[PDB]
Amino acid sequence: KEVQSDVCIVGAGPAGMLLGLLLAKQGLEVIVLEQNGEITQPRFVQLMKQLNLLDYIESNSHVKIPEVNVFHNNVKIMQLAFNTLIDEESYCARLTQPTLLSALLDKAKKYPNFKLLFNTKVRDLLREDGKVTGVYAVAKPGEQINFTEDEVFEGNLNIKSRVTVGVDGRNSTMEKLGNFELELDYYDNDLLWFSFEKPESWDYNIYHFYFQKNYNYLFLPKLGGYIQCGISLTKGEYQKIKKEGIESFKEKILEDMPILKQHFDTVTDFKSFVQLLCRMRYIKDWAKEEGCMLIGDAAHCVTPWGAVGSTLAMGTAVIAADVIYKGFKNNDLSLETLKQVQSRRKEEVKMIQNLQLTIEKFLTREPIKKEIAPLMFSIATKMPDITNLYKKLFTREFPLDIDESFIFHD
């Protein structure tokens, strides 16, 4: 087959869904290819009001989290209310990606200009003329999209689409295909997830972090009146942890957090946990060719602290959407103009990563630094200039300068 949809978007993640909808509202016939966190930041609310999409997003079900609290040995040592960072709307929210992804498509399917092909593993299809034409995708039945007529193409397809963007995600095959380079690749700690019944004593819209004797815990609201917890461990510590047996692991967890005694009286194995790798990649040059460019997690994946991940990629997509809409508005979509995305996001993307690196330094479990890290954190948050850090970690100082046409008027 041969599809000529002017632009192809590899990956149907939250960054891509925003790239297509902001380009389908422009007119460019885009084709999205998909092979198949829950907490948002005040940066997310700023972006949605910027495009006047907040009410549309806020219409769905979501739980607003008003503040972060950090404890040490079951005593509070830090408290920040997000409403106190910027004068505009500012808060964290429990908004699952399926909820946000479908709401973004519900307003995107109404525009036949876009097209998304679900359950389609995609290989590469470059161009011989010193550029990239598109990709080659081995499909699989099941999709609606906007170019099917109930027929589409349930097999091999060639989509020659001029400029090809890579938003596959953290586990991206597009990193290698484009012959890119990872300037920074970070991974030191894991998060061991598990849910439990929220006790009558606790609240629900919670962003709680605990520095306890044996492990450090992260608590978030889980959709359904439950609380999802994440224990922070060193890279490789989980394997050693399973060897010592569930009885010792439970005895240590209940020693730190005695309120989880009821929940772990039923836990008898390690099959209830979920290990997640807190990696953090960075690509040296996001646009190294003509018609080829990397954005999103494929370029600037980050650690989960601060809820920066989901909303940081989206912000880069919006700037790319302004370069792409302005790139066809001046007929300059070459390498020199496509690389302007990274030249505009370098400031915010790097400052966030370094700050994430500094935050990660508190998760150390080496024998002497471990005992003083909570005490250090309490001192750190008590500095005069801590509020600048909170503003830099959670909010944007100025809105993204884009074409006024990107605002959704009603």
Ligand X SMILES: Cc1cc2nc3c(=O)[nH]c(=O)nc-3n(C[C@H](O)[C@H](O)[C@H](O)COP(=O)(O)OP(=O)(O)OC[C@H]3O[C@@H](n4cnc5c(N)ncnc54)[C@H](O)[C@@H]3O)c2cc1C
Ligand Y SMILES: CCCCCC/C=C\CCCCCCCC(=O)O[C@H](COC(=O)CCCCCCC/C=C\CCCCCCCC)COP(=O)(O)OC[C@H](O)CO
Residues in contact with ligand Y by CB under 6 A are 68, 70, 77, 209, 305-306, 355, 358-359, 361-364, 368-369, 371-373, 375-381, 383, 385-386, 388-389, 393
Asked if 351 touches its own copies (CB under 8 A), the answer is no
Task: In angstroms, give the least distance from the CB of 358 to ligand Y.
Answer: 4
Whether the CB-CB separation of 22 and 47 falls below 8 Å is answered with: no
Q: What angle do CA 28, 34, 35 make, to 5 degrees?
A: 155
Nearer to ligand X, 43 or 263 (CB): 43
Q: Which residues ranging from 11 to 50 are in contact with ligand X (CB under 6 A)? A: 11-16, 33-40
296 makes contact, choosing from ligand Y, ligand X, its own copies, none, with CB < 5 to 8 Å by partner type, with: ligand X
Asked if 182 touches its own copies (CB under 8 A), the answer is no
73 makes contact, choosing from ligand X, its own copies, ligand Y, none, with CB < 5 to 8 Å by partner type, with: its own copies
Task: In angstroms, give the least distance from the CB of 378 to ligand Y.
Answer: 4
Identity of the amino acid at 98? P
- Find the helix or strand (DSSP H, E) in which 324 lies: helix 309-329
359 makes contact, choosing from ligand X, its own copies, ligand Y, none, with CB < 5 to 8 Å by partner type, with: ligand Y
Binding mask 118-157 for ligand X (x = CB under 6 A): ---xx-----------------------------------
Q: Which residues ranging from 277 to 316 are in contact with its own copies (CB under 8 A)? A: 284-285
Print the SS3 string covering 6-33: CEEEECCCHHHHHHHHHHHCCCCCEEEE
Q: Which residues ranging from 262 to 301 are in contact with ligand X (CB under 6 A)? A: 276, 296-297
Nearer to ligand Y, 172 or 303 (CB): 303
367 makes contact, choosing from ligand X, its own copies, ligand Y, none, with CB < 5 to 8 Å by partner type, with: its own copies
Binding mask 18-57 for its own copies (x = CB under 8 A): ----------------------------------------
Give CA–CA dist 306/42, Å, rounded. Answer: 10
DSSP for 110-141, please give it: TSTT--EE-S-EEEEEEETTTEEEEEEEE--S
Nearer to its own copies, 225 or 384 (CB): 384
Pick the closest to residue 157 from 142, 140, 136, 143 (CA basis). Answer: 136
Task: In angstroms, give the least distance from the CB of 236 to ligand X.
Answer: 19
Asked if 388 touches its own copies (CB under 8 A), the answer is no
CA distances from 392 to 15, 145, 354, 376 (A): 21, 38, 12, 20
Whether the CB-CB separation of 28 and 113 falls below 8 Å is answered with: yes
CA distances from 347 to 306, 351, 395 (A): 18, 6, 14
Candidate ranges 60-68, 149-157, 242-250, 306-314; the one touching ligand X (CB under 6 A): 306-314
Asked if 1 touches its own copies (CB under 8 A), the answer is no
- Find the helix or strand (DSSP H, E) in which 171 lies: none
In the three-class reduction of DSSP (H, G, I as helix; E, B as strand; rest coil), residue 361 is classed as helix
Strands 216-222 vs 67-72: parallel, antiparallel or unpaired: unpaired
Whether the CB-CB separation of 27 and 294 falls below 8 Å is answered with: no
Whether the CB-CB separation of 220 and 96 falls below 8 Å is answered with: no
310 makes contact, choosing from ligand X, ligand Y, its own copies, none, with CB < 5 to 8 Å by partner type, with: ligand X
Nearer to ligand Y, 74 or 148 (CB): 74
Candidate ranges 130-138, 196-204, 206-214, 371-379; the one touching its own copies (CB under 8 A): 371-379
Task: In angstroms, give the least distance from the CB of 301 to ligand X.
Answer: 6
CA dihedral 33, 37, 39, 42 (to 10 degrees): -50
Whether the CB-CB separation of 303 and 281 falls below 8 Å is answered with: no
Q: Which two tokens stand for residue 290?
A: 């003509």
398 CB-near residues (< 8 Å, 6+ apart): none
Sites of contact with its own copies (CB under 8 A): 73, 75, 183, 284-285, 346, 354, 366-369, 371-372, 375-376, 378-379, 382-385
Sites of contact with ligand X (CB under 6 A): 10-16, 33-40, 121-122, 167-170, 173, 276, 296-297, 304, 307, 309-311, 313
